[PDB]
Motif scaffolding. Structure first.
Motif, PDB file in Angstrom:
ATOM      1  N   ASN A 135       7.403   3.539   2.170  1.00  0.00           N
ATOM      2  CA  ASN A 135       7.027   4.587   1.216  1.00  0.00           C
ATOM      3  C   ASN A 135       6.655   4.023  -0.101  1.00  0.00           C
ATOM      4  N   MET A 136       7.354   3.010  -0.572  1.00  0.00           N
ATOM      5  CA  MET A 136       6.997   2.437  -1.843  1.00  0.00           C
ATOM      6  C   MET A 136       5.603   1.810  -1.819  1.00  0.00           C
ATOM      7  N   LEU A 138       3.131   2.632   0.172  1.00  0.00           N
ATOM      8  CA  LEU A 138       2.146   3.699   0.297  1.00  0.00           C
ATOM      9  C   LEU A 138       1.946   4.369  -1.067  1.00  0.00           C
ATOM     10  N   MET A 139       3.000   4.520  -1.842  1.00  0.00           N
ATOM     11  CA  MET A 139       2.871   5.095  -3.197  1.00  0.00           C
ATOM     12  C   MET A 139       2.058   4.121  -4.096  1.00  0.00           C
ATOM     13  N   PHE A 140       2.225   2.803  -3.980  1.00  0.00           N
ATOM     14  CA  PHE A 140       1.407   1.866  -4.765  1.00  0.00           C
ATOM     15  C   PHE A 140      -0.044   2.073  -4.404  1.00  0.00           C
ATOM     16  N   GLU A 142      -1.617   4.746  -3.066  1.00  0.00           N
ATOM     17  CA  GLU A 142      -2.079   6.061  -3.475  1.00  0.00           C
ATOM     18  C   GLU A 142      -2.205   6.129  -4.993  1.00  0.00           C
ATOM     19  N   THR A 143      -1.329   5.440  -5.724  1.00  0.00           N
ATOM     20  CA  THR A 143      -1.431   5.368  -7.160  1.00  0.00           C
ATOM     21  C   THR A 143      -2.752   4.641  -7.517  1.00  0.00           C
ATOM     22  N   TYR A 145      -5.467   4.434  -5.682  1.00  0.00           N
ATOM     23  CA  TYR A 145      -6.622   5.268  -5.388  1.00  0.00           C
ATOM     24  C   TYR A 145      -6.822   6.232  -6.532  1.00  0.00           C
TER      25      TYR A 145
END
Lengths: 177, 180
Positions: A135-136, A138-140, A142-143, A145
């Motif tokens: 999750n971390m 994936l958040m990097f 998406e951030t 993008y």
């Protein structure tokens, strides 16, 4: 010519959005008349569908030690063209008839990325449990993008590639031994 | 009338984009003749400008009206659950706005980042959080930015992976790791 049309449409759609891009914009970019683009090649929705297909293929193509994980993230930041990232973020405004086909592509991308991250997850070198690590990361992504969609347009230093890389590397230094 | 016109224009611009929304769409949404929009605005570009300004004001009001550790969990929960989707969608589309608005939007983006940074950092307490202050604030800001991305996709595609509750549960799990 078809390849040139799609390449230029990706640039235009990313800059103006689907609603802000016209066939005249696209046709002028390849030196043909707007009616010739429509009748010899495709209407706007089909040019967009083909551009989105090219975008998904670009991200599939693009895609296991700790050093390898840093390099995967470095390449994502510095080797992925912002026009493809912006086109990807803009999928949230896609013409409705393409909803289901785009959803399928998103689900495939998400599964592929998850499977890759599972290969890097090694609790002997990472102080997070599996889900929190995945999750971390994936958040990097998406951030980035989100930031890259603003970065070139406004050039705000807080949205820049190296500032993001350094924030991410600082956090990875804490959790990856 | 102006509040009504702008509220409705935000809905339209967020759904159709700037070029995709017409003055006719806007006037029809509040039940007036198109010519009547001119009692208050000079053109579509001004209505969009006012809409964007409303959008920035909305986020600053939200952030400032929503410093214990549980207060941080609450702030994040409310951002994910209560921020209006139409505003997130309008915000993410700011990178494709009319050229005349470039400097105004740039400066507002800078001001919101500074405001969030300065507000959220008040929740940092080194006796409870294992991360240092800089890494803590950077991570929290990334949770907010990630939600702009996920919210837009969840609304459009309904991918469970992007839902409010799923994201909130992932964020809470990471905050738990950060706490001593």
């Amino acid at each position: 010519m078809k390849d040139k049309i799609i390449d230029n449409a990706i640039t235009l759609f990313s800059e103006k959005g689907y609603d802000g891009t016209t066939l005249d914009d696209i046709s002028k970019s390849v030196n043909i008349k707007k009616a010739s683009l429509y009748y010899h090649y495709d209407n706007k929705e089909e040019i967009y569908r083909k551009s989105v297909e090219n975008c998904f293929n670009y991200f599939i193509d693009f895609m296991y030690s700790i050093d390898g994980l840093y390099q995967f993230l470095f390449k994502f930041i510095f080797d992925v063209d912002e026009r493809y990232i912006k086109l990807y973020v803009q999928l949230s405004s896609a013409p409705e008839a393409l909803n289901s086909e785009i959803k399928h592509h998103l689900q495939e991308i998400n599964t592929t990325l998850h499977d890759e991250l599972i290969k890097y997850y090694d609790p002997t070198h990472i102080a997070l449990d599996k889900e929190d690590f995945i999750n971390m990361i994936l958040m990097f992504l998406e951030t980035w993008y989100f930031r890259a969609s603003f970065s070139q347009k406004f050039g705000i230093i807080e949205d820049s590639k190296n500032r993001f890389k350094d924030q991410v590397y600082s956090l990875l230094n804490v959790f990856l031994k």
